[PDB]
Structure formats: structure tokens, C-alpha cells
mmCIF file of C-alpha atoms and ligand atoms in Angstrom:
data_model
loop_
_atom_site.group_PDB
_atom_site.id
_atom_site.type_symbol
_atom_site.label_atom_id
_atom_site.label_comp_id
_atom_site.label_asym_id
_atom_site.label_seq_id
_atom_site.Cartn_x
_atom_site.Cartn_y
_atom_site.Cartn_z
ATOM 1 C CA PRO A 1 69.622 89.399 6.456
ATOM 2 C CA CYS A 2 73.369 88.996 6.937
ATOM 3 C CA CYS A 3 75.745 88.415 9.845
ATOM 4 C CA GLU A 4 79.570 88.498 9.693
ATOM 5 C CA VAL A 5 81.881 87.724 12.646
ATOM 6 C CA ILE A 6 85.420 88.987 11.957
ATOM 7 C CA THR A 7 87.982 87.833 14.490
ATOM 8 C CA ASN A 8 91.487 86.566 15.281
ATOM 9 C CA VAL A 9 90.114 83.817 17.534
ATOM 10 C CA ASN A 10 90.633 80.424 15.917
ATOM 11 C CA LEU A 11 87.838 77.920 16.450
ATOM 12 C CA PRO A 12 87.457 74.403 15.055
ATOM 13 C CA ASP A 13 84.759 74.178 12.352
ATOM 14 C CA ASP A 14 82.149 72.238 14.397
ATOM 15 C CA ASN A 15 82.312 74.997 17.051
ATOM 16 C CA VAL A 16 82.210 77.830 14.417
ATOM 17 C CA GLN A 17 79.038 76.300 12.935
ATOM 18 C CA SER A 18 77.332 76.040 16.345
ATOM 19 C CA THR A 19 78.058 79.702 17.025
ATOM 20 C CA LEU A 20 76.928 80.861 13.597
ATOM 21 C CA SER A 21 73.774 78.791 14.053
ATOM 22 C CA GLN A 22 73.187 80.299 17.512
ATOM 23 C CA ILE A 23 73.578 83.816 16.101
ATOM 24 C CA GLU A 24 71.140 83.083 13.244
ATOM 25 C CA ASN A 25 68.643 81.939 15.827
ATOM 26 C CA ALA A 26 69.015 85.276 17.633
ATOM 27 C CA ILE A 27 68.990 87.287 14.278
ATOM 28 C CA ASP A 28 63.731 85.490 16.960
ATOM 29 C CA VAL A 29 64.534 89.239 17.128
ATOM 30 C CA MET A 30 63.663 89.448 13.366
ATOM 31 C CA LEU A 31 64.533 82.599 8.770
ATOM 32 C CA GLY A 32 65.556 80.720 5.634
ATOM 33 C CA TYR A 33 67.060 83.719 3.801
ATOM 34 C CA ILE A 34 70.179 84.667 5.752
ATOM 35 C CA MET A 35 73.950 84.583 5.255
ATOM 36 C CA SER A 36 76.317 84.164 8.189
ATOM 37 C CA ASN A 37 80.080 83.753 8.215
ATOM 38 C CA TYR A 38 83.027 83.433 10.519
ATOM 39 C CA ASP A 39 86.017 85.140 8.958
ATOM 40 C CA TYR A 40 89.284 84.152 10.712
ATOM 41 C CA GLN A 41 91.770 87.084 10.465
ATOM 42 C CA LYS A 42 94.754 86.202 12.671
ATOM 43 C CA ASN A 43 96.461 89.562 12.211
ATOM 44 C CA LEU A 44 93.393 91.553 13.095
ATOM 45 C CA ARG A 45 94.176 94.277 15.663
ATOM 46 C CA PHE A 46 92.191 96.551 18.011
ATOM 47 C CA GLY A 47 93.595 99.144 20.412
ATOM 48 C CA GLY A 48 97.128 98.643 19.072
ATOM 49 C CA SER A 49 96.870 95.000 20.134
ATOM 50 C CA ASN A 50 96.520 91.587 18.414
ATOM 51 C CA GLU A 51 94.885 90.002 21.484
ATOM 52 C CA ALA A 52 91.589 88.147 21.066
ATOM 53 C CA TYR A 53 89.099 90.340 19.296
ATOM 54 C CA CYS A 54 85.861 90.035 17.399
ATOM 55 C CA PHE A 55 83.983 92.525 15.150
ATOM 56 C CA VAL A 56 80.361 91.702 14.299
ATOM 57 C CA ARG A 57 78.463 93.347 11.440
ATOM 58 C CA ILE A 58 74.695 92.756 11.214
ATOM 59 C CA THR A 59 72.818 94.117 8.193
ATOM 60 C CA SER A 60 69.065 94.273 8.620
ATOM 61 C CA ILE A 61 65.829 95.226 13.724
ATOM 62 C CA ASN A 62 65.760 98.817 15.112
ATOM 63 C CA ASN A 63 65.197 95.700 19.255
ATOM 64 C CA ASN A 64 68.913 96.180 18.574
ATOM 65 C CA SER A 65 69.995 96.030 22.261
ATOM 66 C CA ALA A 66 68.462 92.580 22.705
ATOM 67 C CA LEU A 67 70.419 91.259 19.716
ATOM 68 C CA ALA A 68 73.718 92.880 20.724
ATOM 69 C CA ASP A 69 73.475 91.615 24.306
ATOM 70 C CA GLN A 70 72.518 88.131 23.191
ATOM 71 C CA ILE A 71 75.358 87.899 20.653
ATOM 72 C CA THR A 72 77.902 89.312 23.162
ATOM 73 C CA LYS A 73 77.225 86.459 25.628
ATOM 74 C CA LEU A 74 77.424 83.817 22.799
ATOM 75 C CA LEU A 75 80.841 85.102 21.664
ATOM 76 C CA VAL A 76 82.217 85.627 25.215
ATOM 77 C CA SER A 77 81.220 82.033 26.126
ATOM 78 C CA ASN A 78 82.119 80.360 22.827
ATOM 79 C CA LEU A 79 85.250 82.368 21.943
ATOM 80 C CA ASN A 80 86.847 83.001 25.396
ATOM 81 C CA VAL A 81 87.257 86.682 24.595
ATOM 82 C CA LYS A 82 86.885 89.651 26.961
ATOM 83 C CA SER A 83 83.624 91.565 26.284
ATOM 84 C CA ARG A 84 85.652 94.818 26.083
ATOM 85 C CA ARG A 85 87.105 93.255 22.920
ATOM 86 C CA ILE A 86 83.727 92.678 21.277
ATOM 87 C CA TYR A 87 82.297 95.316 18.978
ATOM 88 C CA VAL A 88 78.844 94.913 17.356
ATOM 89 C CA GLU A 89 77.816 97.147 14.434
ATOM 90 C CA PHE A 90 74.270 97.195 13.008
ATOM 91 C CA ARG A 91 73.782 98.569 9.512
ATOM 92 C CA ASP A 92 70.153 99.469 8.745
ATOM 93 C CA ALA A 93 70.577 92.422 -4.771
ATOM 94 C CA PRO B 1 87.902 103.851 11.994
ATOM 95 C CA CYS B 2 89.364 100.926 10.206
ATOM 96 C CA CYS B 3 92.286 100.165 7.869
ATOM 97 C CA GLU B 4 92.267 96.945 5.853
ATOM 98 C CA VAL B 5 95.156 95.881 3.642
ATOM 99 C CA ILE B 6 93.909 93.323 1.081
ATOM 100 C CA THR B 7 96.704 91.662 -0.836
ATOM 101 C CA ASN B 8 98.187 88.558 -2.472
ATOM 102 C CA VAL B 9 101.567 89.257 -0.882
ATOM 103 C CA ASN B 10 102.225 86.679 1.866
ATOM 104 C CA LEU B 11 104.136 88.048 4.891
ATOM 105 C CA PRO B 12 105.065 86.250 8.101
ATOM 106 C CA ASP B 13 102.969 87.344 11.073
ATOM 107 C CA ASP B 14 105.730 89.289 12.873
ATOM 108 C CA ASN B 15 106.134 91.445 9.743
ATOM 109 C CA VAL B 16 102.397 91.803 9.168
ATOM 110 C CA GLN B 17 102.065 93.154 12.725
ATOM 111 C CA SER B 18 104.938 95.656 12.331
ATOM 112 C CA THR B 19 103.337 96.995 9.221
ATOM 113 C CA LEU B 20 99.861 97.202 10.719
ATOM 114 C CA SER B 21 101.354 98.976 13.736
ATOM 115 C CA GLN B 22 103.234 101.436 11.497
ATOM 116 C CA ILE B 23 100.020 102.173 9.577
ATOM 117 C CA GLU B 24 98.086 102.840 12.808
ATOM 118 C CA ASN B 25 100.789 105.289 13.818
ATOM 119 C CA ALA B 26 100.466 107.065 10.448
ATOM 120 C CA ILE B 27 96.677 107.326 10.606
ATOM 121 C CA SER B 28 96.974 108.740 14.093
ATOM 122 C CA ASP B 29 99.775 111.146 13.178
ATOM 123 C CA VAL B 30 98.542 112.522 9.856
ATOM 124 C CA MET B 31 94.858 112.671 10.811
ATOM 125 C CA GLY B 32 95.170 113.334 14.527
ATOM 126 C CA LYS B 33 92.504 110.733 15.168
ATOM 127 C CA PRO B 34 92.649 108.901 18.520
ATOM 128 C CA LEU B 35 95.196 106.126 18.386
ATOM 129 C CA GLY B 36 94.123 102.784 19.821
ATOM 130 C CA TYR B 37 90.537 103.420 18.705
ATOM 131 C CA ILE B 38 91.260 101.842 15.355
ATOM 132 C CA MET B 39 90.904 98.525 13.683
ATOM 133 C CA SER B 40 93.543 97.337 11.268
ATOM 134 C CA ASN B 41 93.814 94.059 9.396
ATOM 135 C CA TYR B 42 95.961 92.198 6.885
ATOM 136 C CA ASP B 43 93.783 89.999 4.640
ATOM 137 C CA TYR B 44 95.865 87.543 2.576
ATOM 138 C CA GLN B 45 94.048 86.826 -0.726
ATOM 139 C CA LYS B 46 96.407 84.831 -2.921
ATOM 140 C CA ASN B 47 93.984 84.824 -5.922
ATOM 141 C CA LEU B 48 93.468 88.597 -5.762
ATOM 142 C CA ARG B 49 93.854 90.179 -9.212
ATOM 143 C CA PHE B 50 94.319 93.669 -10.633
ATOM 144 C CA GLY B 51 94.439 94.567 -14.320
ATOM 145 C CA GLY B 52 93.802 90.990 -15.383
ATOM 146 C CA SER B 53 96.909 89.908 -13.430
ATOM 147 C CA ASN B 54 97.673 88.009 -10.188
ATOM 148 C CA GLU B 55 101.060 89.743 -9.715
ATOM 149 C CA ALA B 56 101.880 91.360 -6.304
ATOM 150 C CA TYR B 57 99.174 93.925 -5.424
ATOM 151 C CA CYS B 58 97.749 95.988 -2.544
ATOM 152 C CA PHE B 59 94.237 97.271 -1.950
ATOM 153 C CA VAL B 60 93.977 99.483 1.145
ATOM 154 C CA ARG B 61 90.495 100.431 2.336
ATOM 155 C CA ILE B 62 90.347 103.203 4.936
ATOM 156 C CA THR B 63 86.843 103.573 6.374
ATOM 157 C CA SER B 64 85.750 106.526 8.508
ATOM 158 C CA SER B 65 93.657 117.483 2.140
ATOM 159 C CA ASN B 66 95.712 115.790 4.895
ATOM 160 C CA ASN B 67 94.769 112.652 2.931
ATOM 161 C CA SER B 68 97.664 112.822 0.419
ATOM 162 C CA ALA B 69 100.215 112.822 3.260
ATOM 163 C CA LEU B 70 98.511 109.655 4.622
ATOM 164 C CA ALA B 71 98.243 107.816 1.318
ATOM 165 C CA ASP B 72 101.900 108.686 0.550
ATOM 166 C CA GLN B 73 103.062 107.547 3.976
ATOM 167 C CA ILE B 74 101.238 104.200 3.721
ATOM 168 C CA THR B 75 102.433 103.677 0.116
ATOM 169 C CA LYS B 76 106.110 103.854 1.220
ATOM 170 C CA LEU B 77 105.513 101.455 4.118
ATOM 171 C CA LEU B 78 103.875 98.870 1.825
ATOM 172 C CA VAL B 79 106.409 99.366 -0.979
ATOM 173 C CA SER B 80 109.242 98.943 1.468
ATOM 174 C CA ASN B 81 107.760 96.076 3.571
ATOM 175 C CA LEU B 82 105.966 94.121 0.846
ATOM 176 C CA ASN B 83 108.411 94.499 -2.063
ATOM 177 C CA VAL B 84 105.529 95.514 -4.362
ATOM 178 C CA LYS B 85 105.661 98.099 -7.164
ATOM 179 C CA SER B 86 103.819 101.326 -6.205
ATOM 180 C CA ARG B 87 102.047 101.019 -9.551
ATOM 181 C CA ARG B 88 100.303 98.022 -7.856
ATOM 182 C CA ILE B 89 99.099 99.867 -4.686
ATOM 183 C CA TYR B 90 95.612 101.456 -4.550
ATOM 184 C CA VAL B 91 94.485 103.349 -1.420
ATOM 185 C CA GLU B 92 90.748 103.807 -1.128
ATOM 186 C CA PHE B 93 89.008 106.020 1.417
ATOM 187 C CA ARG B 94 85.384 104.957 1.901
ATOM 188 C CA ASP B 95 82.226 105.795 3.851
ATOM 189 C CA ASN B 96 73.539 102.507 11.645
ATOM 190 C CA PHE B 97 73.905 101.521 15.371
ATOM 191 C CA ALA B 98 77.114 100.597 17.398
ATOM 192 C CA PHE B 99 77.864 98.789 20.738
ATOM 193 C CA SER B 100 80.865 97.796 22.809
ATOM 194 C CA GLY B 101 80.429 94.354 24.484
ATOM 195 C CA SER B 102 81.298 95.820 27.935
ATOM 196 C CA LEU B 103 77.845 97.499 27.924
ATOM 197 C CA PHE B 104 76.545 93.967 28.539
ATOM 198 C CA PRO C 1 85.828 98.978 -9.846
ATOM 199 C CA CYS C 2 85.830 95.694 -8.019
ATOM 200 C CA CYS C 3 84.242 92.216 -7.972
ATOM 201 C CA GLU C 4 84.415 89.921 -4.956
ATOM 202 C CA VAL C 5 83.063 86.328 -5.000
ATOM 203 C CA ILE C 6 82.556 85.121 -1.404
ATOM 204 C CA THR C 7 81.872 81.418 -1.155
ATOM 205 C CA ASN C 8 82.373 78.100 0.674
ATOM 206 C CA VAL C 9 83.058 76.350 -2.637
ATOM 207 C CA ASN C 10 86.749 75.370 -2.792
ATOM 208 C CA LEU C 11 88.276 75.540 -6.274
ATOM 209 C CA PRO C 12 91.895 74.942 -7.246
ATOM 210 C CA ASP C 13 93.756 78.184 -8.034
ATOM 211 C CA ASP C 14 93.990 77.632 -11.835
ATOM 212 C CA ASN C 15 90.182 77.279 -11.895
ATOM 213 C CA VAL C 16 89.661 80.282 -9.589
ATOM 214 C CA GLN C 17 91.740 82.434 -11.923
ATOM 215 C CA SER C 18 89.818 81.324 -15.023
ATOM 216 C CA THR C 19 86.520 82.236 -13.363
ATOM 217 C CA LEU C 20 87.788 85.592 -12.120
ATOM 218 C CA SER C 21 89.058 86.305 -15.615
ATOM 219 C CA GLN C 22 85.680 85.312 -17.132
ATOM 220 C CA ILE C 23 83.920 87.671 -14.703
ATOM 221 C CA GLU C 24 86.276 90.558 -15.545
ATOM 222 C CA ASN C 25 85.416 89.997 -19.206
ATOM 223 C CA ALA C 26 81.692 90.171 -18.430
ATOM 224 C CA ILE C 27 81.991 93.332 -16.325
ATOM 225 C CA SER C 28 84.084 94.817 -19.158
ATOM 226 C CA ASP C 29 81.604 93.737 -21.885
ATOM 227 C CA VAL C 30 78.355 94.824 -20.175
ATOM 228 C CA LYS C 31 84.696 100.028 -19.762
ATOM 229 C CA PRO C 32 88.135 98.332 -20.179
ATOM 230 C CA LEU C 33 89.555 95.990 -17.536
ATOM 231 C CA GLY C 34 92.847 97.565 -16.438
ATOM 232 C CA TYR C 35 91.234 99.627 -13.695
ATOM 233 C CA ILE C 36 89.557 96.625 -12.044
ATOM 234 C CA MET C 37 89.993 94.286 -9.017
ATOM 235 C CA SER C 38 88.597 90.810 -8.624
ATOM 236 C CA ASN C 39 88.926 88.210 -5.884
ATOM 237 C CA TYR C 40 87.773 84.775 -4.849
ATOM 238 C CA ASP C 41 87.427 84.647 -1.061
ATOM 239 C CA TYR C 42 87.124 81.050 0.189
ATOM 240 C CA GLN C 43 85.002 81.063 3.446
ATOM 241 C CA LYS C 44 84.368 77.401 4.301
ATOM 242 C CA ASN C 45 82.054 78.167 7.226
ATOM 243 C CA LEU C 46 79.885 80.557 5.174
ATOM 244 C CA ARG C 47 76.168 79.747 5.618
ATOM 245 C CA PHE C 48 72.912 80.649 3.904
ATOM 246 C CA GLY C 49 69.415 79.599 4.951
ATOM 247 C CA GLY C 50 70.772 77.931 8.108
ATOM 248 C CA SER C 51 72.916 75.673 5.892
ATOM 249 C CA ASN C 52 76.636 75.320 4.963
ATOM 250 C CA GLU C 53 75.835 73.786 1.531
ATOM 251 C CA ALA C 54 77.473 75.322 -1.539
ATOM 252 C CA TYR C 55 76.707 79.074 -1.919
ATOM 253 C CA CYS C 56 77.960 82.288 -3.645
ATOM 254 C CA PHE C 57 77.784 85.940 -2.542
ATOM 255 C CA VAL C 58 79.003 88.343 -5.213
ATOM 256 C CA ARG C 59 79.646 92.001 -4.327
ATOM 257 C CA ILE C 60 80.195 94.354 -7.274
ATOM 258 C CA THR C 61 81.338 97.853 -6.371
ATOM 259 C CA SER C 62 81.602 101.067 -8.446
ATOM 260 C CA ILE C 63 80.016 100.265 -11.864
ATOM 261 C CA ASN C 64 70.916 97.063 -17.123
ATOM 262 C CA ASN C 65 72.618 95.425 -14.127
ATOM 263 C CA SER C 66 70.470 92.375 -15.031
ATOM 264 C CA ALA C 67 72.799 91.532 -17.934
ATOM 265 C CA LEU C 68 75.835 91.394 -15.588
ATOM 266 C CA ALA C 69 74.031 89.498 -12.819
ATOM 267 C CA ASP C 70 72.577 86.896 -15.251
ATOM 268 C CA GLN C 71 75.947 86.451 -16.975
ATOM 269 C CA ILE C 72 77.907 85.967 -13.702
ATOM 270 C CA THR C 73 75.275 83.576 -12.287
ATOM 271 C CA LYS C 74 75.749 81.208 -15.288
ATOM 272 C CA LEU C 75 79.574 81.366 -14.948
ATOM 273 C CA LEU C 76 79.392 80.445 -11.256
ATOM 274 C CA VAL C 77 76.672 77.806 -11.769
ATOM 275 C CA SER C 78 78.726 76.243 -14.499
ATOM 276 C CA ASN C 79 82.178 76.531 -12.823
ATOM 277 C CA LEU C 80 81.296 75.974 -9.147
ATOM 278 C CA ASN C 81 78.547 73.260 -9.437
ATOM 279 C CA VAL C 82 76.291 75.336 -7.209
ATOM 280 C CA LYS C 83 72.508 75.682 -7.433
ATOM 281 C CA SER C 84 71.437 79.104 -8.773
ATOM 282 C CA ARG C 85 69.050 79.385 -5.826
ATOM 283 C CA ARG C 86 72.273 79.602 -3.778
ATOM 284 C CA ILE C 87 73.761 82.556 -5.661
ATOM 285 C CA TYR C 88 73.150 86.215 -4.645
ATOM 286 C CA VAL C 89 74.575 89.264 -6.416
ATOM 287 C CA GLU C 90 74.836 92.660 -4.730
ATOM 288 C CA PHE C 91 75.793 95.963 -6.257
ATOM 289 C CA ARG C 92 77.146 98.745 -4.150
ATOM 290 C CA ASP C 93 77.394 102.302 -5.383
ATOM 291 C CA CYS C 94 79.017 103.738 -2.286
ATOM 292 C CA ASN C 95 84.976 109.226 -1.365
ATOM 293 C CA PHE C 96 88.369 108.699 -2.949
ATOM 294 C CA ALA C 97 91.481 106.801 -3.965
ATOM 295 C CA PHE C 98 95.166 107.850 -4.342
ATOM 296 C CA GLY C 99 101.082 105.284 -6.247
ATOM 297 C CA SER C 100 102.530 105.437 -9.787
HETATM 298 C C1 LIG D 201 65.101 94.053 -4.144
HETATM 299 O O1 LIG D 201 66.409 94.207 -3.629
HETATM 300 C C2 LIG D 201 66.700 93.623 -2.451
HETATM 301 C C3 LIG D 201 66.259 92.364 -2.154
HETATM 302 C C4 LIG D 201 66.563 91.762 -0.948
HETATM 303 C C5 LIG D 201 67.334 92.422 -0.028
HETATM 304 C C6 LIG D 201 67.690 91.856 1.174
HETATM 305 C C7 LIG D 201 68.525 90.762 1.266
HETATM 306 C C8 LIG D 201 68.840 90.257 2.504
HETATM 307 O O2 LIG D 201 69.643 89.245 2.760
HETATM 308 C C9 LIG D 201 69.959 88.281 1.928
HETATM 309 C C10 LIG D 201 71.146 87.658 2.093
HETATM 310 C C11 LIG D 201 71.467 86.648 1.288
HETATM 311 C C12 LIG D 201 72.622 86.016 1.406
HETATM 312 C C13 LIG D 201 70.625 86.240 0.332
HETATM 313 C C14 LIG D 201 69.407 86.839 0.132
HETATM 314 O O3 LIG D 201 68.513 86.470 -0.815
HETATM 315 C C15 LIG D 201 68.899 85.593 -1.835
HETATM 316 C C16 LIG D 201 69.084 87.876 0.976
HETATM 317 C C17 LIG D 201 68.339 90.858 3.611
HETATM 318 C C18 LIG D 201 67.530 91.948 3.453
HETATM 319 C C19 LIG D 201 67.028 92.556 4.567
HETATM 320 N N1 LIG D 201 67.235 92.410 2.260
HETATM 321 C C20 LIG D 201 67.770 93.689 -0.345
HETATM 322 C C21 LIG D 201 67.472 94.286 -1.545
HETATM 323 C C1 LIG D 202 83.604 104.716 -1.078
HETATM 324 O O1 LIG D 202 85.037 104.857 -1.171
HETATM 325 C C2 LIG D 202 85.535 104.776 -2.438
HETATM 326 C C3 LIG D 202 84.857 104.026 -3.420
HETATM 327 C C4 LIG D 202 85.344 103.943 -4.698
HETATM 328 C C5 LIG D 202 86.517 104.603 -4.977
HETATM 329 C C6 LIG D 202 86.994 104.558 -6.260
HETATM 330 C C7 LIG D 202 87.133 103.330 -6.884
HETATM 331 C C8 LIG D 202 87.603 103.277 -8.169
HETATM 332 O O2 LIG D 202 87.712 102.003 -8.697
HETATM 333 C C9 LIG D 202 88.956 101.478 -9.005
HETATM 334 C C10 LIG D 202 89.505 100.290 -8.438
HETATM 335 C C11 LIG D 202 90.774 99.832 -8.875
HETATM 336 C C12 LIG D 202 91.390 98.704 -8.367
HETATM 337 C C13 LIG D 202 91.467 100.555 -9.863
HETATM 338 C C14 LIG D 202 90.900 101.712 -10.425
HETATM 339 O O3 LIG D 202 91.514 102.461 -11.374
HETATM 340 C C15 LIG D 202 91.727 103.821 -10.920
HETATM 341 C C16 LIG D 202 89.660 102.143 -10.008
HETATM 342 C C17 LIG D 202 87.898 104.522 -8.794
HETATM 343 C C18 LIG D 202 87.729 105.765 -8.121
HETATM 344 C C19 LIG D 202 88.003 107.022 -8.707
HETATM 345 N N1 LIG D 202 87.263 105.734 -6.869
HETATM 346 C C20 LIG D 202 87.201 105.343 -4.010
HETATM 347 C C21 LIG D 202 86.713 105.443 -2.725
#
């Protein structure tokens, strides 16, 4: 398992860790072997714009709607970002 | 589609954004792909090395012919804007379920 | 050819460069190292197993993989003070590149 949030929204660490932990919980849908990360990229753009944006890559679930939906609420509510500016990719050592 | 510039060259944000914006234009122009529907990013990695050396360097990943025109175009932008030798610029084209958050 | 170490272990730059250089050697031992990238990406909030304790993800792109993995794992265990349970090594064999 692996989850990466890539975003230009700056959160304090305590808040980042809550969010990552909440996403791990979600990622019920299908643990002690998982790697999550919040990668702060201030210059990240989408739609020709550097406004708040988050890209989520989940590697790994087939179910996938439940996870996407769940994550999208977490990030809208914890990152104060418009849900139009959330993209969730699922890729399925 | 997605362009990521990965580099140990530190630029101020205003400059980073100009560059990213110029690159988006290029992708759109040279490939005819829908502008706006692109990610770009500038990932500052100070300890990034190439050839056993931490000197100025650019890795450009383009994910998801005409391609020479694009590579060339980008290479000038980064040479100009980053003051990096073109002998330290590499431009890599590389290649599942997807959702927008408005669907929820 | 490319190695990226992704980790929440903060090292000073001189140390980071030594390690990256030691990894380049390894990759080279087990072609030559002038057509090769490496990087140390510090991600402080990186987690594994629900925990933000020390950890290393290594992605190796475009390259007896066991010899390389084993070698790198010792380097990182030694130089990052991380448990080897908390080190994972992926190889990707994923197309073209284009200055000089
Ligand atoms: C035998 O080769 C393998 C072994 C394990 C995986 C694997 C690894 C996965 O995630 C991780 C992620 C991280 C950080 C560590 C890990 O194990 C140490 C597994 C998730 C899935 C679904 N598969 C993939 C290939
Ligand atoms: C999946 O997209 C990809 C993946 C790998 C490459 C690639 C990667 C290569 O590795 C490198 C990387 C670097 C920094 C220098 C280099 O010397 C040419 C080769 C070489 C070639 C011919 N192609 C190009 C595109």
C-alpha cells in the first residue's frame, strides 16, 4: 500500500499527520504495511493556476469510489481547498 | 498530463511561476493538447546529483516526432531562466482509475 | 538511470552527498556513473505502518537486483541510523529522453 498527497497547501505538521492518519484509516476499504506522505510543493499548478490544489496517488481496491469520496471530504475539510481542485488517481520491492 | 521540473537550481517563486507558465504554453502549442488540463511543478532538490556532481542540473519528466520541438523549446526556457548549461538538462517523456473531487 | 531515496531522516548536506555518492558507486559496481541521477528527498511527514519513525523508500529506475538492494540497505542502515525493517527498495522498469 502507498498514499501520496501532493499539494501547494501548507499545513502545520500536527495537522498533516492527522490527515495522513485519517487517509490510512480509509485506505477499512482494504494495516501495518503502508507508506503515506504529504509533499508540500508551493509552486504546483493546475489549470494554469497556482491556487490551492491537491493531487492524490493511491497505489493498491478496485471499492475505489468509496475511497475517493472519503478522501475528498477529508482534504476539503482539512485543507480548505475547493473539491474541483482535488484530483485522485488510483494505480492498480 | 503533467510536467515536473526537478532541479537543484533555486529560483524565487515569481520566476518559478513564469517558467512553469511558459512550459505549459509550449506543451499546449507543440502538442496541441488542451491547455489548462495540465499539472506542472517545480521541485527544488538541492542535493540532486548528476554524473557524480551536485552542480546546476535539470530533470524534466513529462508524463502522458513533434517531441523534439517540445524538448528544444523547454531546453531554451530552462537554459535562459535557470542559468544552467544545456549539457545539464535531461528531458524525459514517460508513461488505473481517476476522479475529480467535484464528483463528490 | 536514477536513484531516489525518500525519507523522513534529516541528514546534513555533506552526509547526504557522501551517501548518494556511495549509492552511485554500488549501482555502478553491481555500467559507469556519468549517465546517472541520484537524490535525497527529505519528507519529514513521511509515514510507514501508521508511524512517523525513521524510514527509507528507495526507488531505482532504468537498470541479481538482490546484490544492489542488500548493498544499499547496509549503506542506509549504517548512515541513517534506521532499522532495516524500515527500509523498502523498489525497482521500476517503466518512452524517451532528449541538450548538449
Ligand atoms: C514481491 O514484491 C512485492 C512485494 C510487496 C509489494 C507491495 C508493497 C506495498 O506497499 C508497501 C509499501 C511500503 C512502504 C513498504 C512495504 O513493505 C515493506 C510495502 C503494497 C503492495 C500492495 N504491494 C509489491 C511487490
Ligand atoms: C518511461 O520514460 C522514460 C524512462 C527512461 C528514460 C530513459 C532514461 C535513461 O536514463 C538516464 C538518466 C540520466 C540522468 C542520464 C542518462 O544518460 C543518457 C540516462 C536513458 C534513456 C535512454 N531513457 C526515458 C523515458
